[PDB]
Design a protein around this ligand. Sequence first.
Ligand SMILES: [Zn+2]
Ligand SMILES: [Zn+2]
Ligand SMILES: [Zn+2]
Lengths: 92, 45
Amino acid sequence: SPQESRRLSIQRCIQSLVHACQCRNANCSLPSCQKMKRVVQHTKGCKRKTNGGCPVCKQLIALCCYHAKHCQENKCPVPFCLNIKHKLRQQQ
Amino acid sequence: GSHMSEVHPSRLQTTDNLLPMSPEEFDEVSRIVGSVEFDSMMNTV
Ligand SMILES: [Zn+2]
Ligand SMILES: [Zn+2]
Ligand SMILES: [Zn+2]
């Protein structure tokens, strides 16, 4: 499991971000959920992004691309999954 | 060792460690995503 250990580790964060996009607990029992909420809240009000040099936005954007390449739903809870698949599906 | 001549930045904040994914995980994501239209994800066009 060379690259597989990394591939399978990314799924932990995808499930945690998907959970956090629906969760309402200010201090949820999941350690990642508490962090994922701070991360989306940052991006929801940032002024830097991938175009200015933001390391946080670019981190969500990678994580969301990994999911959105496979995702095909129009009601998905992750805000960027939609934005990314809408652009990616145009390619051939 | 660089691609610019700027002596120092003009703005900084503590909002740089919230990072939800590790360098090794991010590298494996970058291999599959291949930066498709990556610097345009916020523009949705
Ligand atoms: Zn939660
Ligand atoms: Zn940002
Ligand atoms: Zn999705």
